Design a protein around this ligand. Sequence first.
Ligand SMILES: CS(=O)(=O)NCCc1ccccc1
Ligand SMILES: CS(=O)(=O)NCCc1ccccc1
Ligand SMILES: [Cl-]
Ligand SMILES: [Cl-]
Lengths: 304, 304
Amino acid sequence: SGFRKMAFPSGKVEGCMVQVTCGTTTLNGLWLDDVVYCPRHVICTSEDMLNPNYEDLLIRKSNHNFLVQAGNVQLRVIGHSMQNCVLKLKVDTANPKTPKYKFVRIQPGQTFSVLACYNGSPSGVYQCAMRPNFTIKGSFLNGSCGSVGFNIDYDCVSFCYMHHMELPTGVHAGTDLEGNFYGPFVDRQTAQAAGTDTTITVNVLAWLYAAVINGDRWFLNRFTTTLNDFNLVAMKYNYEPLTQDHVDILGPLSAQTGIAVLDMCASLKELLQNGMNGRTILGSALLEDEFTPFDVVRQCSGVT
Amino acid sequence: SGFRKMAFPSGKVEGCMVQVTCGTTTLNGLWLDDVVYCPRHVICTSEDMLNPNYEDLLIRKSNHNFLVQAGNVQLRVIGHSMQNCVLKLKVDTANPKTPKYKFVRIQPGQTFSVLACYNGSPSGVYQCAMRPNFTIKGSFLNGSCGSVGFNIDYDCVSFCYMHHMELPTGVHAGTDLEGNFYGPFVDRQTAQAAGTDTTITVNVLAWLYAAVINGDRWFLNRFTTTLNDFNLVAMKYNYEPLTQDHVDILGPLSAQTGIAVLDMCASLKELLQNGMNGRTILGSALLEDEFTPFDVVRQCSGVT
Ligand SMILES: CS(=O)(=O)NCCc1ccccc1
Ligand SMILES: CS(=O)(=O)NCCc1ccccc1
Ligand SMILES: [Cl-]
Ligand SMILES: [Cl-]
């Protein structure tokens, strides 16, 4: 029993982290097979970051300008290319610790683990969601750029995020491993406001299911609702609209607890309209939205 | 910027997890050098768990009865001994992935990471505190026994916890790696109630410091207090008493933010007496107590 915000075991990713230095700028890179991936702004001075033309800056950079250190050992750079907002540095040595991996672009609402790194060395691991405004709420200090987000299916690491940026509001923006920003963000020291950080409704519902399973029952009410009625309340409370695709995904949690999805929606509706009245659910005083239905099934079944 | 509940990178510990089977019971063991550590109740049937005499049960167990599997490879058991509530199985092969390690008995209020494991395979990592009643609030299903809690100082893993038990209230009890239970708990299927789960005051204060650093300011008030006045309010709210040792430990956070510890105490006092009024601090609607002062310094400075 018990339900915790849980990250993937990070070992497989720890084995991929390197330090990348280009001039005076040091950040992290991801070493998979014989390629190091890092944010392209490794080539920039803080002065370059105002209006950087990256192709122009990269003309002044050769293979030997990129310093790649894995542990306390230098890697030989034998090729470099820009892909979107990432540099792919080819090195003359395959990472002997390359796990099975995929690059995946996630959707808003999807959760992933972050291995926070400084100088190619892991400091910590935490669980995040891609927010509906394509920001993440991370923990990232200077030097943390190139720290990655990932999911693991048994032995295959799916890399979904690389850290590039803090917005002036202190939320985080980054790319997939093809170097494509989540959301409208660009890697420039310029005005970039996030949109509405709405609540991930399907995730709240999953976590209410996790609560019931784990014995937190008090919020269960006498009501049901419809998707249309629930969505009117969702809109008012800056909750993402619930679709039948979300209902479908919650099916296994519904089946276990014998609580129909629409009934759990009616209990969420009452929680939105009446608040917690100083009560807690799985040790939270607010409705948690960084557990997917898949996360809840995984944790409550014990997949490894 | 940003402040997250962060676990230690788990790789070094993942390299130590094995499966231990004794008869029909499978749980996890920790393989350090040429010793496997596991909960002694590996020898028990659920029928044995009612009033187990462990020395008597262990007479019916030889080296070959303990099945130790590291990955998909069997280890040869060449010796076994009971230490308190743990079995130490000597194996004929040092764990080639043994990190630098210490066994440490932590105090209530101290935080640690848990690598949740099933059949010797890691499922997840999360951050816990030893509660003042010597329980932890974990995420542990059947098969998770022998999952360990740890801190890391650079390259040295300090092992502080091994998982043994769920209490009927669904909170968790276990041992240090010398097999000594935290708190009064025993490894028996019997009546065991936890005491008062008080709030770890020094940890709340640290997290209020983390909040200020990260730009959450709204709760800062116009008041100060004394340890004696604060402690009267603490008592009423089932907060641990604050000592001058706690004040001393918060010194570095006080110095950074130029907020005297007693001033932060006065702001905590007002939060206890007036509530959050529907507001949040570092995305929490309640006062978080699972960050130590050391955790806050580590995360806010970026130790690796
Ligand atoms: C090259 S640096 O040392 O000055 N750091 C870059 C951080 C940054 C990334 C994207 C946009 C704004 C800033
Ligand atoms: C030996 S088992 O399969 O039945 N599981 C033991 C779990 C347990 C541990 C301590 C006290 C009560 C129960
Ligand atoms: Cl950086
Ligand atoms: Cl178990």
